[model samples]
Target: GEVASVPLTNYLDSQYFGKIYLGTPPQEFTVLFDTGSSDFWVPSIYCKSNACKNHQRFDPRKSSTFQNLGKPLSIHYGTGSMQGILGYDTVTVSNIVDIQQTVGLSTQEPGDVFTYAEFDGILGMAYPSLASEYSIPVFDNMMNRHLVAQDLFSVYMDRNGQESMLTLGAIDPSYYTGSLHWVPVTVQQYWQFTVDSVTISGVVVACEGGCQAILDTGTSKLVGPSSDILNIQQAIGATQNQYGEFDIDCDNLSYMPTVVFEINGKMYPLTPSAYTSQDQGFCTSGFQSEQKWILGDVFIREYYSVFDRANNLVGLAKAI
Candidate 1:
């Protein structure tokens, strides 16, 4: 009861976003709660971009408590970018409320990646370093106002399940089992830590000298460095088909060995069933090759994640 629980919609195990109300009468906006980035914003009626026209935008005139910060704001994401001005309003997140919260009001949203989005805007949950200039992140505002009972928030995500929990303030023990393995954050910008090694069949396969991995709620899949990913995929019997999508034998899941990641002397393993996802009528490996190693939704769904912002720690445990 100490935590404020925000309900999230898992879109085909791809996008994870939720609802938050802003303004005096509360203009409802659906935002992707992204831990990989930080910048709280909503679409604005002033935005002439095609992406904004299709979304529910906020009108400052309609909000009684809206404060015009009037600072030019710009946020760049891998999928899109936003051009706007900073403003403040009464922001309500589930059961948590922050009065006079800094918010980005988009004047332009350029990119088709955001154009086809089911949600209206993105709510970044990363650190202040990743936030836009002259803006405080929503969570930081919560801490400053002391809105939460605790300084940490936890995530318990489920695949194909419409509902999930993004509990602010405290970790929900009922959602996890055993002990929560606390891992220290190596970088303050992202929820990053050192991954000791990745092994399969009790043999080291990747992350030879302790690679860096970030827990990203925004990302949909488990991605490793290019060469590292190929090694793990090969070990798991994942082969690319004609279209270059990593294909695996869906029925013969038993043939795949468990992939273990050693972190802070603890071993977290992912079975084949936990690492593959449904894509285009086929069971494909949920891992991709990226510049950075990321443990995304595909891994988070298996292990409930606790992001302790104040303590600079990450707690992991088996999900129920």
Candidate 2:
């Protein structure tokens, strides 16, 4: 049994990245540990896309042990797609290593989003079921090879604290306080659960009965249906700007009500400051309306999260 913890670098308060090594000689890359998707991919030398030109691209010829699967792979995100070839190579995260793990090497990427992305690529932490066909998934291989102590991991995010860490195979007690409130996972495809309700000052504002909620480290803001989030927007007096983002008066943030999420009899509260990002005298709500309800970095940065695959549960506690 082994435990590995890696420090994460924050990217404009939107994403978090960690260092991971690939290949026999070990080439390092800054990657996103995304729970919203399942696949491990990096740009390849063959990629001529503008996005790959400025980022780190993997050179298989440099790794003596690299194995070419010669299979085509494509992963579609909400806003973009990653098209590449599948292969096998060594992947090292912190002290944990996975030999001959399935890896994707991008040959085509047509999005400007990745061109400006802070990280080189993404390493998904979700289950293999959600992965592309025949992809083994990095974590699954890690667990199968007994590379980690347990089939669990924890994430800690700090907005202005300047530091965060991702714990693999174990939970670090120092990052959280009180007890880890465990809740059963309602679905396996995603780390989703049924939220009892979302409230403003103890009054139900959304999800009055129950609604599906997914914990996504890849997303930057809390998201829900337009109608549902409208209630929250109006309650907080957030005005929609030309960009469709909710903007609030910075001076009045202190008087704003708390946005509380209820789960399994436990209440997790996000103070006005916690639910808003301030910049250049304007404060923007960390919440947005989308097709799905997702708790992203905004909520994650407020609480420490433990994803337990072994027990099909998710644990949340107050971050220390």
Candidate 3:
């Protein structure tokens, strides 16, 4: 069940900022545009919880382009929960055209679990395969209507405020800094990779010696059985705590070897970022060291994702 993909869309909301609303003084909260899932919602002004009291709320009435759809809705995640009703509104981003949809209007105050994400409502319809209910994903919709190229599009998730490109309807040549090697996609929505074997310091993995691996963006860390994870950590003198987490001496972690992938006898190596920490170990580098290594956005950020629907292939090569 290893697979991954990125869908392009022209739905641009330039000034979209993550915001929260407060009380009777009905305020508006701005947030980021996420296309990974459905369910549009923000902190509600009427809620009287600690999470609500501190966060901003979205006042539909204040939005110049707001419209009400009056449809009820609900959503639950593998780790959290959320629910609300549907409403239509024209959400604008900078000088770009306003993206319209019947987004969710929430009434539940599930604490500030969402605040932990530090994001506004996600766009939901991120890929072409997204359910027809969340409306059409921005990019696939464009491709269907002949507004952009169907061949491919790319995304660069750089550091916060570090300008990255999201090209819809066309390929952003900038994302690719090298020749792209196209591999046949083996499955559906999941990003699956053909792995030769798990190795540590040039040694074959004593445990899950070889297997296909799934690269999951939604996951927060590398996950796998104990033996497979321990082997890799041991390779670099990294120690594994009782909890099964590995600690790499952070003095110069980037210099450590990368987890490599072998396809057609070629070695495609991943950088420290693939298994390293963004915190850089200031407080201690804590990446959930497990078996699956569900390479999340942290890994994809370095490459150009190509979903070759026509040929039914998924191509991933180093990003330029």
Candidate 4:
């Protein structure tokens, strides 16, 4: 296949890997900013299925910057997904963009019943491992290649305002909206950090049984073991009867008191929306169950997260 697709802007806090438009007159669908896995991917117009339908696919033949070098590639999400070739082209955005590393081009088939992936492709931002060849993420590539700034990127996901910003080549001084608390990462592969303890409201949630809370940007919701899940629901007093997907009053977020996780000798708080579900009439809510707390942005929005590549750790703070 050819090399270096177009440079596209990635949203640092959308989802782990989502397609986002650059500016008012968007050019290409840049993958949501990711810090896990170094491979970047985008769906192809050729993909026809439920997953593809929800996402905006890229058509090399559509934009004036379209180029086809004829490359074939595929990726398996480990969760179960077989994607197609990753084409190389110039993905453009407003002020930020990456020349190209390896952008997802298309899918292996039209249907994705096996993988159950609802999105188009992913923007791998993880460190190079057996998964992605240790190549820098598209965003980091921009920085390494002189695209973004050389500081940290912050994600503000509060009930009042949820906005994400990416500092190109340098940390945006203004991005640091609040206090910064650094979390030392123990596991390099995953953005793993230390959790002194967890409190739902004022109650301490136990994990020894099996529901240990782990920080994960790839997941969309908080998953936990049955025991912890049940206890948490009971504490909130807000019937968490609904299983997979349910709606709760956004105002009722109070029922799910601010969750606090102790990290690196310091305690940090998460907005109710970070853990609660956005009931149709209200705001952000969580999709809870008794298995694993697939902690997503719902819990991560409160901090200005930083993936320290050199030290092999993940840092967290109020903002900045």
Candidate 5:
């Protein structure tokens, strides 16, 4: 069995993209390595969206190994959706290859969300239960074929898009400084787990009775329920704008209390710098409003993360 450890590039600390070779002769494409959703989709040559015009697209006609399933595939997100044709082809990531992996070549992507995106497609690293299509995911296929040593992967990202890495099938101890803290996965759908609470200066602000947190590598900021997020903003003396984003004084950020997420009886602290983004002389809180808590790149960038499908667990540790 071989392990696939590949470097990734982060776009302004917002989205992480990685390279993958597809088709028989190996056409290269940059994709978003998303852990929040399931399914592998790329823009096809038939796509009409302006978002796909400048990006690399998959052309089945050019690949001898391409197989059209004649099935339509669609994936909807909170703000947008993508419609495409499902097919099978040879997909390669690093050294791992899936000869007949299921894939979606999108022909329509209607949304402003991806208008300026640098990546061409999304490579979902979630469970089958969360997959938009009824097909085995890339990781599952690799594991089934014994292409990896273990059913696990790790993610490490540096601040401000400096460096990023993803290791398939094994954890790299060199990425983290301390022993990895393991936690049980309550739901297999989205790498979900229970959080003890969210606090500021050791005072509980939300999730006092525990709440569900999804580790979403695809997301850029932390997100929680509106009510809870409002409280967090107030605690940090932040003001909300018309877009529902929190704004704070850059000068006062250093004086702010440490925002903490308590999980499994352990406290994980996020510094003021980690929780806020400074751009164009304005400071914006990285926390946003959502139905559930999403521990996105803001938090994960501060820690090394390990996702284990074999044991259904998630491990985290301070990055070296």
Candidate 6:
């Protein structure tokens, strides 16, 4: 049982961070274990952006094996953006190592919120095809080099999980209690899957026919089409505030209906506790306005998730 395990640090239940090393002597940097995107990047010494001022930056001057490809690397998020150069270096996560892994070294990352993120960089795990530039995903590199026992990784996100783990290579039966329900991946880019229907108390509220969704550990809330989110808000007695944020009554959690998501002909139900969060002094519904549906940490916190690159199957089970 000496598997390469990750004892993730729970940051306000918004982000789960783990440590990864890069370079010769293993320069350590805390990173976001993001399944939503695919590209490994970190700030480097050449960065002069304000966001890099407060974060740890990679220094190739010290690493003897570092090789600068001298190519452009630019990545954009909904809000944050990073501009950097591509390079080849050694990357170590948990205990598995990716020799000569292509990585990004940001020299111009700009964002007010990005400067304050607890994680120094992002380690994406979607697919190699989604990777930017000519870089291959760290996970794919590990698979090619046979660094793990299996071509899958499992995640267990607990708001208060002390020993909460993100294990690579193989599944740890101790993290889950029930049998794993394996489902197929609909898209190769993301861990995208087809959901049959979304229901509330036997009444279909969203995803009437079928819909696409990705299990994104990087995001904090569930994001779906505006229409579907609106219907769910109305059915659950939630109201939109002045800023259009869905508000719910914290005292009504006990009486709230369970939201069910039917996938692969199996029913997965979410209690009120899993869809509402106490923020400031009010409760906020987990639904957000977006084009594609995303089952973020709000949903994963309740179920132990496993992603298999070998068969493109997604597994879910009851968290222990």
Best-fitting candidate, scored by lDDT: 2
Off by over 4 Å in 6: none
Instruction: Give TM-scores for every candidate, taking all chains together and pairing residue i with residue i.
Output: 0.95, 0.98, 0.68, 0.71, 0.97, 0.96
Stretches > 4 Å off in candidate 1? 241-243
Residue-by-residue lDDT tens digits, candidate 6, 135-157: 88988888887888888999988
List CA RMSD, all candidates.
Answer: 1.7, 1.1, 7.0, 6.0, 1.3, 1.6
Candidate with best TM-score: 2
- In terms of lDDT, model 2 sits at 0.90
RMSD of 1: 1.7
Candidates 2 and 5, the one with greater TM-score: 2
The lDDT of each candidate is 0.87, 0.90, 0.49, 0.52, 0.87, 0.87
Ranking by TM-score: 2, 5, 6, 1, 4, 3
- Report the lDDT tens digits of candidate 5 across residue range 2-118: 799779897878888999988988889999998998899899998989877868889888999999887888886457788898899999999888889989999898777666787
Give the runs in model 4 whose Cα sits over 4 Å from its true position.
1-27, 50-55, 61-82, 109-120, 130-136, 143-146, 173-178, 200-203, 208-215, 242-256, 271-274, 282-287, 290-293
**Angstrom error at residue 117, model 1:** 1.8
lDDT of 2 by residue, 188-275 (tens): 9889998999988768999978889999999989999989899999998899999867899999977888999999989999999888
Error of 5 at 16 (Å): 0.8
The positional error of residue 127 in candidate 5, measured at the CA in angstroms, is 0.7
Candidate 2 all-Cα RMSD? 1.1
Per-residue lDDT of 157-218 in model 1, one digit per residue for the tens? Answer: 97547658899998888988899999999989999999999998778889997989999998
Better of 2 and 4 by TM-score: 2
lDDT tens digits, residues 1-320, model 4? 01221222223233443344422234445354544345666667777755676666777665544545456555655345545664555545344554544465666534454224444566655655524432335655554665544433444343344345433333333545655566565555556555666676656774432222446555556666667666665665445434544445565666566666665657776656566655446443453664334556666655656555544555565653
